Design an enzyme around this catalytic site. Structure first.
Site, mmCIF file in Angstrom:
data_model
loop_
_atom_site.group_PDB
_atom_site.id
_atom_site.type_symbol
_atom_site.label_atom_id
_atom_site.label_comp_id
_atom_site.label_asym_id
_atom_site.label_seq_id
_atom_site.Cartn_x
_atom_site.Cartn_y
_atom_site.Cartn_z
ATOM 1 N N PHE A 38 33.039 40.429 -5.365
ATOM 2 C CA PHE A 38 32.640 41.501 -6.250
ATOM 3 C C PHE A 38 33.769 41.986 -7.143
ATOM 4 C CE2 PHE A 38 31.564 45.953 -7.046
ATOM 5 C CZ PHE A 38 30.269 45.853 -7.452
ATOM 6 N N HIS A 79 24.945 49.892 -2.275
ATOM 7 C CA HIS A 79 24.947 48.707 -3.113
ATOM 8 C C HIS A 79 24.534 47.485 -2.302
ATOM 9 C CE1 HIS A 79 26.294 45.966 -6.352
ATOM 10 N NE2 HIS A 79 26.121 47.036 -7.106
ATOM 11 N N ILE A 116 33.703 38.516 -10.872
ATOM 12 C CA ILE A 116 32.475 38.773 -11.615
ATOM 13 C C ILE A 116 31.817 40.017 -11.035
ATOM 14 C CG2 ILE A 116 30.312 37.758 -12.499
ATOM 15 C CD1 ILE A 116 31.483 35.014 -11.487
ATOM 16 N N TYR A 117 31.241 40.846 -11.917
ATOM 17 C CA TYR A 117 30.458 42.034 -11.562
ATOM 18 C C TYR A 117 31.329 43.025 -10.781
ATOM 19 C CZ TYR A 117 26.222 44.500 -9.722
ATOM 20 O OH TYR A 117 25.276 45.429 -9.357
ATOM 21 N N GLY A 118 32.316 43.536 -11.527
ATOM 22 C CA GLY A 118 33.527 44.073 -10.925
ATOM 23 C C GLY A 118 33.329 45.359 -10.148
#
Lengths: 431, 120, 461, 247, 484
Positions: free
Chosen positions: A359, A376, A363-365
Site C-alpha cells: 500500500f 480500509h 501504488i495507492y499510497g
C-alpha cells in the site's frame, strides 16, 4: 480469569490486578464514553459555510454555483448561531448538548444529545440533526427568499441527497457514513492515524492505546469476540495497547539506546520463556529448541506486545513513520523463525504488514501511514493488532511526511482535546 | 512432423562461447527456426534516479557467423529449435555436448509458434 | 431534417448513443498541482515545464498498457488545462487545452476565477476497457497509468516512502470522477448514469461554449439528458423523448417571446436583466407556457395523435415551462417549480397525465422544490438521477438537466456546476461531438457514427 | 538472558542462515568510506550529508516517553534524508537470500526499513545509518560481488542463470570481472564514477555452495533437512489449529 | 531462422497453441471478454411461483401447451422485440442474435411434453448419478435460463441483466396468458422474476469497493466452478480442477483486477505436471483415494494435508531447480509460488473431498516455498497467504467460510492478484474427486450446460487459446450500425 496489571505512559502503576473482562468494550464505562462522544460529536466550519455562500463553491470538489452568491457574515456573529443551533439540536433544555465556538468564530462544535443517539438505530443521526439545525439557523438569520433556500441548504449539506455522502458540506463527523463500511461492525474503526495522533498530541503509547481502543471496539461489535475468542482478543488489547505489566515499555527502555528488532525478539522470547508461557517440547539434533504454547491467547498477547514494542524501537530510533511496514512483518517473521511458534494473530499481523508495505511504497499510497484506519480494505484483516502500531509510529514521526499532524489538527485534535478520556486514554480506563 | 526442442544451459551464455554454440547449430541439418532469448541488455538506464545514463555492456556483440554477420544484441540462453527430422532430436543433444563446456538441462514439446496469433 | 424511424434510434440500435455514454464513462479528471507540491517539497526535484512536457509524452503514449494492443487502443490521450497562463504557454501545443482559446473572454475569466491557478489533466482511457467491464475502473486504470508515468518520467525508484507520498498525491488526492457511488438497491460504482448529476451533464455538453442563445443551449441539454438518463439508466417506451418533431422548440421560443414581452427583456443573456423569482412570476410563465402548448395540441390534432401517450405530452409541456422559468429568473428551482406547475395544469386541463407512475416525481415534485430538509432540498444543478424522487422511472430527467442549464445559460454563465467538466470536454478530439449532441444522434440513427471500442481488428471477418 | 538466536537446520545452509541473521560473518574485503558513499550514488563522494529537514536537536521534539526512551541514531539527530541500498541475490548458491538479508538488516541495524521481494531487497534508513549498513553488507561474506550486485533500479537477474565466469547477470554492469578481480565502476542506480573500486575476489563455485543460504536439491536438499521441514510443519499446524480453536 | 526476445511465448496448458503474454490480455483476445460477457448476461428465474400465481389468482389453467406458448412468446420477446402491443421500440434483430431462454425441470414427466427446442434435459446432458443428484437437489421444480443480449450488457453494465429480464418476462406472460397488460397479477409475476425467484451468479459488493453488483468480485468460487462444464463432459478430476484454475486465474486476476504475470498459472504445463505427479502419489500412498468415488476418500486430517502438500511442493521445487525453464522473465519469481500452491491445493482436495483441506495445502505450499528459497513472490503477494492458513478452519464472522462459498469479495482476497484462480480450482477439486454433479449451485451446472453459448464452457483454457489466435467470434459487436 486473567488478571492483567495496567501501567501508564511513564510506566507507573494505575490499578493493580484488574480483570481482563473489565477492559471489554461492552463492560468498561470509559470506552463507552469514548465511543458515545465519537458517535455524537460533529464539527461545523462556519468560515467554510461563509465562503460557500459568498463564492458559490458548495457540494464537492470543483463545484461552483455561479450567480447565486448570498453575501453574509457568519464568523462575525458566531455566538448567536451557536445558541440558535443549541436550541435546534437539543431535545430538551439542559440535556447532554453543548455547542461551543472555536477561536476567531471560524468553527463550532455540535454535540448531539444522548437521546438522539438512543432514538436512532445507527450513529450518524448527529450529523443530520446538526446539519439541519445549522441550515435552519442560517435561513432564520438571513431572512432569505425561499427561492434562495436551496443554496443556503447545500452550502451546509453539500451535494447530499444526490451523493450518498454529504461531499462538501461543512458539517463533518469522524466516522464515515454506514454505507461506507467495509463489513458488519466496522463503522467504529474508521479513524485514521493522523487524527488519532492529533487527538493525543503525538504521544506514542498514548496513541497506540486509542487506536487499540477503537479497534477492539470494532472487534467486539462484529461478533469476532464471543466465547473463548473474547478472551483472546481482550488479552491482545491488554498486552499490546494498554501496557500490560509494563511489558511494551520495558522492551523499549531496555532496547532504546542500541536495540533493534532482533534485540526486541530476544527480549520478549526470554520474557515468554521465563513466564512459563512457552515451553520447549523437542530439542532438534542441531541444538534447535522447538517451542510449544502452554496458553495460546497469552502467547499471542506477548506477540502483540512485542510487535508494538518493536515498532516503538525501530520507528522511534529512525524517527520515521514508514517503518511499520517493515517492522511488524520482519518482527513477526523472525519471531516465528526464532521460536517455532506462530507470530502475532497467527500470521494475520504479518500479512497486514505486507499489505501496509504494498500500500505505502508503490501504488495507492494512502499518505504514508497517516491515512491508516482499520476500516480500509487492506487494514481490516488483522483482528486489532496493527493499526495501534501504525498510529504509534505516526506519533513518533519527526516531520518526514507532508500531510503533517498540523494539517488535520484543527479538524480533529482540538475538537477532541478537551476530553481527558480522549487525550490520555490509558489512565482514563477505570471500572 | 517438426518437433520442438529447446537447449537450456545451466549458466547464461557469455558471448565468448555464444559465437561457437550458435554457429555450431547452423551445421545441424534440417533447420526451420532458431529461437533464443536471454535477459535484456539496455544501452541506457531506464529506471531510478540514474535514468538517462549510457551503458556499454561486456555481454554485447555476441555473434559472428561468417557467412553473415549478426549484429550486437542482448544475452543468449534457452536456445529453442525447430527441426524436421527426429533423428537429430538427440544429435542436437549430442552436438550441444562438444561446444557447450558444461552441463545443460532439457525439456521437450511446445516452445515455438506454428500458426499466427492475433497480433500477427 | 435527417429524422428517421424511432426503431433505429433505440440506444442499442444507435451508435452515437453508445459512444457518448462511453465517452462520458471513460473520462476522469485528476489534479496535478499538489503532486508537484510533493515533488518540490520532499522529493528535492524542481518541476519545470520541460518536466511537465516529458510527463505528457510519457502519459499519453502509455495509455495502452505500455511501459494492451496498440492498434485497438487509440482513443486514449491525456490533455492538460490550467487556470494559470504563466505555465500554459510553455506546455506543448499538442497536449494543452487553452481556456483562453476555446472560450470567450468573460467565460474564460469565470473559469479562471473558479479554479484559480491550478493545473488539471484530462484522462481518457480506452473504450474497450470501459466496455469489457463497467466504467468503474477508469479511476484505477488512470491511477496506475499516472503512477507509472511519475516513476518513468521523473526518475524515482519504486518502493520508497517519498514515492508513496507522491503516489497518494498523484491520484487519490485530487480525483474528479463523473459520478460517485450509489445507494442500497442499485448499488453501482462511480462513473455511472445514476451519479451523473444534472449540472455535470450540463457541463459535459458544450453548446454553452459555442452559442449565445440560452434557449438552444437549454434544449440541447434537454435532448442529451433525455437520451442518456432515460434510455440508459432507466431502459424503452416511445424512447424518442422530446428531441423530435420540435413541439418543445416551438413552445420554448414562444415562452422566450412571452418573457421578453411582459418582463423587460428578462430572457436574453446577462445577469443584470433578471427578474427575482417569486411565486407570481413562476405562476405566470408556467401557466402561459402550459396553456399555449395545450392549445397547440388541441388546435393541431395530428400533433396530439403523433405524441400518442400522455407521458411525452406531460414531459414536453413541463420541460418547456421549466426552461422558460429558469431563463426568466436565473434560478433553477424556479424552473423546477414551473415544470411541476405545468404538470398540474396539464392534468387539470385534460384529466389524464401519464402511465401509472409518470406522476411519482410530480406530486411530490412541487413541494420538494424549495425545501431545505435533509434528503428533500437540493439545487437543481446538484441534482441527478440518484435523487430520492427521481430515481426509478422514465421520462423526466432530461428536462431536469435542461432546466439547470437554462438557469446558468440565461444569465450567460461559463458553466453550470463544474469548470473542470466544461473545459475537459472542450476538446474536439473526442469521437462524440458534445457541442451538438442532438445532431449526433441524427448521425447515429442514419448509420453515420463511427465509434471506437469495436473489436473488429482482433476477431475474424 | 535469552542469548540464543538461531534458525532450524543441521546442514551447511542452516549454519549460514544462522550466521546471516546473527551477522557473525567474517569480513572478506575492503571498501573505504568515501568509496562506499561514492558507489551509493546519492550525493557527491566525500561531502557532507544533506538534510531534508533541520536537526531534531534544535527544533525540539514533542513530549513523548518513547521519544525520550529511544536513541535517535546519529543520522536522524542530524536530520539527514532517507536513502537506500539495493541488492539482487542470485538463486544459484549466492551467500544471501532476500528474506535473510532482510533479517540481517533487522537484527543488526537500527532505524532500518528493510523490504523483501523475490528479486531485490530495499534497505531504507537515514544516510548515516544506511551508510554503515551498506558498509557491513559489502565488506563481509554476505555480499559475494559476483553473486550479488548492488542494483538500485532494474534488479532483474536473481532467478537468471549465472554467467559463465560464475558472476550473476549484470543488467547495467554495476560490477564486473576485470583482470581476474571484481570491479565496481557505477553507482547502485547505474551512473558511473571517475574512480574504479577494487571490489575484491569472487568466490569459486564450490566455495559459495559451502556458505550459501538457499536450499538447492543439487547442493543441500530441502527434503533431506527434516529439521526445517518439521519447523514448517510445526508452524503451519499451530497456525491452522489455533485458527480453529486458539486454545 | 534466427531471433531474440526477452519474454517466453506461452503455450496454453494442455494445448499445442501458443500466445505471447501481451496478447493473452483481456483487451486483445476476445474470448477473455466473451466468457465474462456470458457470465454477465445470464440470469436464472424460477417458474413455479409465477405459475401458481397464474393458477390460483386468475383461475388460469397451467399446462404444457400454454407453457410451450409462453416460452415461444418469451423467446421471441427476449431479443428486444415487442410482444405486448404498445408502440415500443424494438432492438434490431441482427444485433441481438445471442438471446434465448431454456427451461430445465426436476420432473421428467413435465420435461417430456415441453417443446424440446426450449428444454435442456438433465438426462441427455448428465450421466445417471449426476442427473439423480441434480434432480434430488432442485426438487421437482421448474427453472429457466435467461440470456439477455451481449450488446445490452456490453453497453451499460451487468446490473441490467436481471432488470431487462424481469421487464421482458412480464410482457411475455401478459402476451401469452392474456392478462390486462397492467394489473395486480403482473406485479406478482415480475417480482417473482426479479427478487423472489431470481438467482444470479453475481451478488452485490460493498460501496467501499468501487464496483457494483454482478461484477466478478461477487461471483463466488463455487459459482465459477459450477459455471464451467468440464465436470459434465470429462471424468479425470485433476483435469477438471486445473480447467477451473485456468478459468479462475483469467476472470479473477485479469478482469476483476487489472505486470500481467498470472497468465502463466495456466500456461506451459508446470501446474499440470505437478498435479499429475501428486495424484499418482496419493493413488500410490492412500490406497487409490484420489480416483473417482465417494467412499474411497481419506478423511481430511491435518497430517494428510501436511504429507500431500509438502510432497507436492518438494516435487515442484525439485522440478524448478532442475529445469528452470519457466523462469528468467524480467519480473521473475512470482507466479512461481502460485503454481506450486495451486498444485498442492488441488492435490489436497482430490484426496480428502474437503475444500478447506485444499486451502490448507495451498498455504502450507507457500510456507514451504518461502523457507526453501528465502523469497516469496513479488512485493504484494503474501497479504492473504500469510493470513490464510489461520483463516481457513476458523468460524468467525468475516473469516469463516468454505472455499465453495468464498469469492474475490472475501476480505483477504480483495486486492491481490494471482490467487483466486487456484481457489476456484480447489473448490472444484473437492467435488470432482468424488464425481459430484455440482459443487455449490446446481442451477448453474444445468444453466451453462448448453451448446448455443458462443463461449465453450466445456474447456475454458482451450477457448482462451482458440481466441488468442483469432478464430473466436464474439457476440456484442456493433456490426451493422456503424459505417464500413
Amino acid at each position: 480469569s486473567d488478571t492483567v496489571d495496567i501501567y501508564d505512559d511513564r510506566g507507573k502503576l494505575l490499578e493493580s490486578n484488574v480483570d481482563i473482562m473489565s477492559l471489554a468494550p461492552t463492560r468498561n464505562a470509559a470506552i463507552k464514553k469514548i465511543i458515545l462522544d465519537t458517535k455524537r460529536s460533529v464539527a461545523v466550519s462556519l468560515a467554510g459555510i461563509q465562503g460557500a455562500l459568498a463564492s458559490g463553491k458548495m457540494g464537492g470538489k470543483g463545484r461552483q454555483i455561479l450567480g447565486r452568491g448570498l453575501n453574509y457574515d457568519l464568523v462575525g456573529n458566531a455566538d448567536a448561531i451557536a445558541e440558535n443551533v443549541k436550541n435546534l439540536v437539543q431535545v430538551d433544555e439542559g440535556d447532554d448538548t453543548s455547542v461551543k465556538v472555536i477561536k476567531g468564530g471560524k468553527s463550532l462544535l455540535i454535540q448531539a444529545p444522548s437521546s438522539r443517539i438512543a432514538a436512532g438505530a445507527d450513529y450518524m443521526s448527529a450529523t443530520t440533526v446538526g446539519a439541519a439545525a445549522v441550515t435552519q439557523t442560517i435561513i432564520d438569520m438571513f431572512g432569505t427568499d425561499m427561492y434562495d433556500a436551496p443554496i443556503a441548504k447545500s452550502a451546509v449539506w453539500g451535494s447530499y441527497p444526490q451523493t450518498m455522502d454529504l461531499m462538501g458540506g461543512n458539517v463533518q463527523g469522524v466516522l464515515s457514513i454506514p454505507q461506507n463500511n467495509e463489513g458488519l461492525g466496522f463503522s467504529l474503526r474508521n479513524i485514521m492515524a493522523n487524527h488519532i495522533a492529533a487527538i493525543t498530541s503525538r504521544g506514542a503509547m498514548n496513541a497506540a492505546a486509542l487506536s487499540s481502543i477503537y479497534e477492539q471496539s470494532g472487534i467486539f461489535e462484529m461478533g469476532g469476540a464471543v466465547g473463548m475468542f473474547e478472551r483472546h482478543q481482550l488479552l491482545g488489547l491488554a498486552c499490546q495497547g494498554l501496557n500490560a505489566n509494563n511489558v511494551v515499555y520495558d522492551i523499549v527502555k531496555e532496547n532504546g539506546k542500541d536495540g533493534t528488532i532482533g534485540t526486541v525478539i530476544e527480549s520478549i522470547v526470554g520474557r515468554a520463556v521465563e513466564d512459563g508461557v512457552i515451553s520447549v517440547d523437542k530439542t532438534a539434533p542441531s541444538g534447535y529448541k522447538f517451542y510449544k504454547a502452554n496458553d495460546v491467547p497469552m502467547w499471542n498477547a506477548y506477540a502483540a506486545a512485542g510487535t508494538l514494542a518493536a515498532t516503538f524501537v525501530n520507528c522511534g530510533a529512525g524517527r520515521a513513520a514508514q517503518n511499520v511496514s517493515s517492522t511488524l512483518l520482519y518482527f513477526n517473521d523472525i519471531l516465528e523463525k526464532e521460536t517455532g511458534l506462530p507470530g502475532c494473530d497467527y500470521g494475520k499481523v504479518q500479512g497486514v504488514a505486507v499489505g501496509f508495505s504494498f500500500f505505502s511504497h508503490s501504488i495507492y499510497g494512502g499518505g504514508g501511514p497517516g491515512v491508516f484506519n482499520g476500516n480500509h480494505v487492506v487494514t481490516r484483516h488483522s483482528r486489532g493488532f496493527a493499526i495501534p502500531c501504525v498510529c504509534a509510529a505516526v506519533a513518533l514521526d519527526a516531520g518526514t511526511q507532508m500531510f503533517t499532524i498540523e494539517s488535520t489538527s484543527g479538524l480533529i485534535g482540538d475538537v477532541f482535546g478537551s476530553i481527558e478520556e480522549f487525550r490520555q486514554p490509558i489512565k482514563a480506563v477505570a471500572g | 512432423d517438426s518437433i520442438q526442442i529447446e537447449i537450456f544451459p545451466s549458466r547464461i551464455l557469455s558471448p565468448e562461447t555464444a559465437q561457437k554454440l550458435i554457429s555450431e547449430l547452423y551445421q545441424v541439418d534440417g533447420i526451420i527456426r532458431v529461437m533464443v532469448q536471454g535477459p535484456r541488455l539496455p544501452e541506457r538506464v531506464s529506471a531510478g534516479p540514474g535514468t538517462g545514463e549510457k551503458v556499454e555492456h561486456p555481454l554485447r556483440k555476441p555473434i559472428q557467423i561468417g557467412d553473415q554477420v549478426i549484429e550486437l544484441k542482448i544475452s543468449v540462453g534457452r536456445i529453442r529449435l525447430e527441426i524436421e527430422n527426429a533423428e537429430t532430436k538427440e544429435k542436437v543433444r549430442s552436438v550441444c555436448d562438444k561446444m557447450l563446456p558444461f552441463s545443460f538441462e532439457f525439456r521437450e514439446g511446445h516452445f515455438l509458434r506454428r500458426k499466427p496469433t492475433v497480433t500477427d | 431534417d435527417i429524422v428517421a424511424e424511432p426503431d433505429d434510434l433505440h440506444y442499442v440500435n444507435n451508435a452515437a448513443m453508445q459512444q457518448m455514454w462511453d465517452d462520458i464513462r471513460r473520462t476522469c479528471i485528476v489534479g496535478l498541482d499538489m503532486a508537484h507540491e510533493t515533488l518540490e517539497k520532499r522529493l528535492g526535484k524542481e518541476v519545470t515545464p520541460e518536466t511537465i512536457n516529458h510527463y505528457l509524452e510519457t502519459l499519453n503514449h502509455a495509455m495502452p498498457g505500455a511501459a494492451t494492443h496498440p492498434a485497438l487502443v487509440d482513443d486514449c490521450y491525456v490533455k492538460i488545462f490550467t487556470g494559470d497562463d504563466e505555465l500554459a504557454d510553455e506546455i506543448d501545443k499538442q497536449y494543452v487545452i487553452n481556456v483562453n482559446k476555446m472560450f470567450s473572454e468573460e467565460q474564460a475569466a469565470q473559469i479562471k476565477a473558479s479554479i484559480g491557478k491550478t493545473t488539471w489533466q484530462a484522462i481518457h482511457i480506452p473504450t474497450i476497457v470501459s466496455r469489457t467491464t463497467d466504467g468503474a475502473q477508469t479511476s484505477r486504470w488512470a491511477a496506475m497509468q499516472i503512477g507509472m508515468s511519475f516513476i518513468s518520467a521523473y526518475a524515482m525508484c519504486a518502493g520508497e516512502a517519498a514515492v508513496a507520498d507522491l503516489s497518494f498525491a498523484a491520484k487519490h488526492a485530487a480525483l474528479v470522477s463523473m459520478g460517485e457511488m450509489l445507494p442500497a438497491r442499485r448499488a453501482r460504482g462511480p462513473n455511472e448514469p445514476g451519479g451523473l448529476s444534472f449540472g455535470h451533464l450540463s457541463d459535459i455538453v458544450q453548446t454553452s461554449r459555442v452559442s449565445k442563445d440560452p434557449a438552444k443551449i437549454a434544449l440541447e441539454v434537454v435532448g442529451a439528458g433525455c437520451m442518456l438518463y432515460d434510455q440508459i439508466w432507466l431502459g424503452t417506451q416511445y424512447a424518442t423523448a422530446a428531441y423530435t418533431d420540435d413541439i418543445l422548440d416551438n413552445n420554448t421560443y414562444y415562452d422566450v417571446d412571452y418573457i421578453n414581452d411582459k418582463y423587460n427583456g428578462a430572457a436574453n443573456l446577462g445577469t443584470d436583466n433578471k427578474v427575482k423569482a417569486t411565486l407570481d412570476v413562476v405562476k405566470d410563465i408556467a401557466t402561459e407556457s402550459t396553456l399555449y402548448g395545450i392549445e397547440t395540441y388541441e388546435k393541431f390534432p395530428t400533433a396530439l395523435e403523433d405524441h400518442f401517450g400522455g407521458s411525452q405530452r406531460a414531459t414536453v409541456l413541463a420541460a418547456a415551462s421549466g426552461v422558460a422559468c429558469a431563463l426568466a429568473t436565473g434560478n433553477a428551482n424556479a424552473g423546477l417549480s414551473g415544470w411541476y406547475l405545468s404538470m398540474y395544469v396539464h392534468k387539470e386541463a385534460w384529466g389524464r397525465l401519464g402511465f401509472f407512475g409518470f406522476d411519482l416525481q410530480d406530486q411530490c415534485g412541487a413541494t420538494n422544490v424549495l425545501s431545505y430538509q435533509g434528503d428533500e432540498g437540493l439545487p437543481d444543478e446538484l441534482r441527478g438521477p440518484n435523487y430520492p424522487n427521481y430515481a426509478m422511472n422514465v421520462g423526466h430527467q432530461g428536462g431536469y438537466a435542461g432546466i439547470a442549464q437554462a438557469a446558468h445559460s440565461g444569465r450567460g454563465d461559463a458553466f453550470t456546476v463544474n469548470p473542470l467538466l466544461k473545459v475537459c470536454f472542450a476538446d474536439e478530439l473526442m469521437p462524440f461531438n458534445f457541442a451538438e449532441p442532438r445532431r449526433e444522434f441524427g448521425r447515429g440513427a442514419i448509420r453515420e457514427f463511427m465509434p471506437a471500442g469495436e473489436r473488429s481488428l482482433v476477431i475474424p471477418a | 538472558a535469552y542469548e540464543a538466536q538461531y534458525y532450524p537446520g543441521a546442514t551447511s545452509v542452516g549454519a549460514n542462515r544462522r550466521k546471516h541473521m546473527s551477522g557473525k560473518l567474517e569480513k572478506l574485503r575492503e571498501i573505504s568510506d568515501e568509496d562506499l558513499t561514492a558507489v551509493l550514488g546519492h550525493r557527491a563522494p566525500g561531502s557532507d550529508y544533506p538534510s531534508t529537514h533541520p536537526p531534531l536537536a534544535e527544533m525540539g521534539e514533542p513530549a513523548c516517553s518513547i521519544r525520550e526512551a529511544v536513541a535517535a541514531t546519529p543520522g536522524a539527530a542530524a536530520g539527514d534524508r532517507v536513502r537506500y541500498v539495493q541488492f539482487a541475490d542470485s538463486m544459484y548458491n549466492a551467500p544471501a537470500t532476500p528474506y535473510f538479508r532482510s533479517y540481517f538488516a533487522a537484527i543488526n541495524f537500527r532505524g532500518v526499513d528493510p523490504g523483501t521481494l523475490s528479486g531485490r531487497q530495499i534497505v531504507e534508513a537515514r544516510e548515516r545509518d544506511m551508510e554503515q549498513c551498506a558498509k557491513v553488507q559489502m565488506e563481509t561474506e554476505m555480499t559475494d560481488p559476483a553473486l550479488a550486485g548492488m542494483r538500485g533500479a532494474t534488479v532483474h537477474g536473481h532467478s537468471v542463470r549465472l554467467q559463465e565466469d560464475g558472476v550473476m547477470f549484470d543488467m547495467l554492469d554495476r560490477r564486473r570481472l576485470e583482470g581476474g578481480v571484481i570491479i565496481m565502476d557505477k553507482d547502485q542506480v547505474a551512473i558511473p564514477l571517475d574512480r574504479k573500486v577494487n571490489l575484491g575476489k569472487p568466490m569459486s563455485s564450490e566455495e559459495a555452495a559451502k556458505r550459501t543460504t538457499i536450499y538447492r536439491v543439487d547442493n543441500v536438499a530441502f527434503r533431506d533437512d527434516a529439521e526445517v521441514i518439521e519447523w514448517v510443519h510445526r508452524v503451519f499446524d499451530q497456525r491452522t489449529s489455533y485458527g480453529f480453536q486458539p486454545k
